[PDB]
């Protein structure tokens, strides 16, 4: 619920960075953007839930108390590398960490959250992913938790 003052300062500074209006309270879309920026773990469905909760509030901006509350909601997940490495393994029929980009991205987009074609293209290009070869995921999650 209540975080370390270091994280408080980091969140306020991220606010100010994304405080285009300068109000000090982050917008819903800006809330999702900074959640993506701060290594948080929001779901697209969870993001829409937060958006509609703020719309019910009606201000359109995230105050610090609710921000800390949804920090608590995020860190209650306590997700680690190993669970999603295992998820990739069950997706990796090879089992060697090297996974085919084509089928992996098809399952990634078609099943569950649907990705736009652009997002897939830039994510493949910038994440050293080969066009059709077998790409390792372990380093990706290692630098997930490293960030």
């Amino acid at each position: 619920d209540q975080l370390t003052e270091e994280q408080i300062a980091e969140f306020k500074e991220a606010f100010s960075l994304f405080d285009k209006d300068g109000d000090g309270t982050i917008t819903t879309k800006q809330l999702g953007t900074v959640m993506r920026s701060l290594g948080q773990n929001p779901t697209e469905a969870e993001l829409q839930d937060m958006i509609n909760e703020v719309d019910a509030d009606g201000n359109g901006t995230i105050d610090f108390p609710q921000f800390l509350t949804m920090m608590a909601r995020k860190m209650k997940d306590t997700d680690s590398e190993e669970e999603i490495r295992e998820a990739f393994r069950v997706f990796d029929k090879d089992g060697n960490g090297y996974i085919s980009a084509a089928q992996l991205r098809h399952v990634m987009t078609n099943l569950g959250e649907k990705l736009t074609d652009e997002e897939v293209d830039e994510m493949i290009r910038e994440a050293d992913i080969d066009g059709d070869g077998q790409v390792n995921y372990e380093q990706f999650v290692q630098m997930m938790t490293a960030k």
Binding site: I84, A87, F88, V90, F91, M108, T109, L111, G112, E113
Partner: protein, 48 residues
């Protein structure tokens, strides 16, 4: 005449009963396979 009518009736009854049992078993296996596929689909969606 009584014997033969009763016999043919029983034969068709047994045919119908065997049909019903086979259909119930096949429906059971079909539903099991469908539920298994749905569970695997849910796993894939969550991981994605």
């Amino acid at each position: 005449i009584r014997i033969q009518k009763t016999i043919r009736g029983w034969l068709l009854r047994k045919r119908y009963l065997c049909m019903q049992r086979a259909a119930i078993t096949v429906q059971r296996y079909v539903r099991g396979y469908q539920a298994r596929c749905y569970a695997k689909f849910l796993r894939r969606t969550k991981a994605a």
